[PDB]
Amino acid sequence: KSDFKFSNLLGTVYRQGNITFSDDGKQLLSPVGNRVSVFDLINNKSFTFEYEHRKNIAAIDLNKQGTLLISIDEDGRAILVNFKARNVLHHFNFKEKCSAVKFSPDGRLFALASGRFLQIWKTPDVNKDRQFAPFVRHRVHAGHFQDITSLTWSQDSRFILTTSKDLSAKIWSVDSEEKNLAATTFNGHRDYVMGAFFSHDQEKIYTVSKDGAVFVWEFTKRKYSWRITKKHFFYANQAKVKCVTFHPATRLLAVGFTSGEFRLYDLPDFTLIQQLSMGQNPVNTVSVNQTGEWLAFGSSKLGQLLVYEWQSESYILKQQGHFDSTNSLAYSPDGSRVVTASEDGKIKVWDITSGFCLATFEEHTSSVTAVQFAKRGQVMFSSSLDGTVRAWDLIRYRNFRTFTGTERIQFNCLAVDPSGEVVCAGSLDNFDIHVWSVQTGQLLDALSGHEGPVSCLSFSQENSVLASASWDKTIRIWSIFGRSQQVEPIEVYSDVLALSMRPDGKEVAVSTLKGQISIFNIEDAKQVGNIDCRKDIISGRFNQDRFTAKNSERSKFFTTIHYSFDGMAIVAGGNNNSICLYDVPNEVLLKRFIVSRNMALNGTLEFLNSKMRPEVRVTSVQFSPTANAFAAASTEGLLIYSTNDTILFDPFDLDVDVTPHSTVEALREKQFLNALVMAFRLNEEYLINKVYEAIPIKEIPLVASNIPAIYLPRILKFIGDFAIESQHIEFNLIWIKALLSASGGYINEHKYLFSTAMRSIQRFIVRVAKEVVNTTTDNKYTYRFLVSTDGSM
C-alpha cells in the first residue's frame, strides 16, 4: 500500500546541461533540473533517476560501455551513478564550476574542466565494491589562463583537446612519454573558443569560436609546426555560436547559435548541409549519435528538446516542457496519459511510459487553471483566467465548445457531470457558480449562496450532487437535478481550499487553511472525521524572508487533496515541499514525500546556511485510476510516485510450510490451485508469474473458479500489470474471461475494491488487444474484396 517510490518525472524534457546519447544510441540522457531523465526512443519508454543533486546539474557523461554515469552540478558536486543498477556509487565534490566532463573512448579515464584546470581522473570499476575514495587522480594540467569551455578526447584515448575563454586551445597527451607530441597551443580567435575537435585521422584540428570562425589547423610547413590552413566564417551577424559538436567519422560539424538557428556543415570543405531553426531562444546544447545520424538539440529557456535526423529531414522528437508553470493535471480514465494545464496558456497530453507529449492545445489566451476528463476519455474540459471554460474532443483534437459567463470573470476551478450534460465552474472573484449545459452551449444557471470566492468544485460520481467549497469557511451541497434546487450548507472552522469527493459519493474531504483535512458525510451533513496535518508539513525557509520556517504561515496547509480509488487514502500537497498521504479510517500519516532537495528552488531548506527564486510547490495531486501511483504537479515537473511489487517482501498469511520451494513442488506435482494460492501467500511477483504461466489452458476455469475471494484483487491487478506489456495475449484473455465468468458477481458487488484492477484490465483489452483485432479484421475484409470482385483492365 503505502510503499511508494519515485518512479518518473513527466514534463520538462530538458532544463540545463548537455544531452548525451547512449553508445548504441537508443536512449538519450537529458538533464532535467537536478534529476536526470533517460528516454528510450526505440523501446518506447522512459525513466528518471531517483537520486537528486542539490543544485541544477550542468554536466553529464556516461562511458560507452553504458555501465556508469557521472553528473556534475553547477558548483561542482559530482555524483557517480551505476547506470544499470540505478544506484549512486560516489559523491565527489570538485571545488568549482565544472564546464564539461567526458569519459575516454576506452572508458578507463575521465577528464573534466574545473575552472582553468583540466583534470583527468581514472574511472573506478563497476564490478568493484564501493570504497571510501574510488577515484584515483591521474593528473591536473594548468596551461589556460581563463576558464576552460570544452573537452574533446581523441579517437584513441591518447590526446585531449581543450578550449578556453582565454582565446586559445591546447592539446595535452594523456601520458608523460608523449608530452612532445602534444605541447602546442592554438591562438588566433577573436572570442571564446567554443570547440576544438580532431578529424577522423587525427591530422587536422578544427577550432570553432564564439564570434563565428572555424579554423583548420594542419601539421604542415609554410619544419612542420601546426599552421592554420583555412579560416571559414559563419557570417551570422547578430547571433553568435552557443554550442558546437563534431562527428569526425561523417565529417559533420553541428553548430547552434543564440538565435535558435542551427547550421550543420561538412567540415573540411565547409559546405552548408543544412540550416534551420529550433525557435527564437538560443540553442544551449548540441549532441550527436555515435553513428552520427541523430542530432539532439536543447534550448534551455523554453525547456525544449529536439532530436533530429539530418539525412531524412525529419524530427524524431519535438518535446518542450514547462518549468514552474503548471496549474493542474488530470489522469486519463485509463492511467496511460496525464493532461497538464499550464500557466503559459496551454494543454499538454503526456504519455506516462514514454515520457513525451502527444498533443498540445493552445486556444486559451491566459493561464489554464483546471483540466478534467469526461465521457470516459473522449472529452476534456479546461477553464482559464481569460474568462472561458472550453471543451476538447480527444479524437478529432478540436475545441468544439466554449462557455463564457455574462460578467467577465476569470475561472479558477471546474467540475463536470458524470453523465456529461452539464459543466460547472467557479471563480475567485464572483461568489457564484456557473452552470452550463454541454449539449447546447447556454448558461443553464448561476448558483448563488456563497459569501466568499468559490475555491473548489466537484460532482459526486455516483448520485450526481454538486459540492462546492469556498473561502467563507463553508462547504455547500447542491442538489441540481430534478425539481429540488436544494442547498445544504455545512460550515467548517476556517476557509476551504481543495474539496475532494469519494468515489462512491458518500463523503467529501475538504482541506482547510487551519491545516486540517475534514471528512463529512454528504447525506447526513455531519463530520465523519478529520486529520490534523499542519505538523507533518515541511515548510522551508525562503531566502528573502526574515522569519523562521517554524513561525512561518506560508505553507502549513494543503491546497490540493485527492482520494484514492478504493476510497481509503488521501494524497495531499500544497505550497510546501512535502506531499503527504493518509488513510482516512485511522486518520494517520502513511507517508510523507520530500518533493525537492534542489537548493536552487526557494522553499526547500528549513535552515539556511548562516555563512525571485522559483519557490517549490505542488499545485495538483491525483491518484492513478489503474495502477497504484500518484502524480504531483510540482515546479520541477509531474512527479510520478509508484509502488512496485518486485521488491518489499510483504506476505499474506503464510505459514512455515509456505515457501518458494514448496510452491514449485506443488507446481511440479501439478496441484495448480495450491501452487497459485501459495504464490499469493508469498506475494512474490516472480513466483506468481511462474505459476501463472505454468497452469495449462485445459484447467484455467477450474482454478479461476476455485480462487478464494481474498486473492481476487491480487490476481486481477497482477493480470493487469502483466498483460499491458506481456506478449501472451490469448493466455491473458483466457484468464480474464475465466475470472470474469467465474467470479464476476463478487466484483460487481464489491466495485471499489476492484475499481483499479478492472480499469487496468480494460486498459489491456482496448489498447493492445483491440488494436490487434482491428488489424486482423481489416485484413479479412481486404482479402474478401481483393478476391471477390472484378479487376480486369
Binding site: 535558435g260 519535438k318 498540445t360 483534437y397
Partner: protein, 39 residues
Amino acid sequence: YKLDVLSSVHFVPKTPTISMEDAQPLYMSNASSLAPQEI
C-alpha cells in the same frame, strides 16, 4: 505579461527552412481527424 508578472506571487520565467514546429498537437498518427459530418 509585464503587468501580471508584477501583479503576482509566484515566479513567471521571461530565414531557414523551418522553425521545426516544436509545439504541435493532433498527433497519435492522425491524418483524417475530421468528423464524418464535417466531411
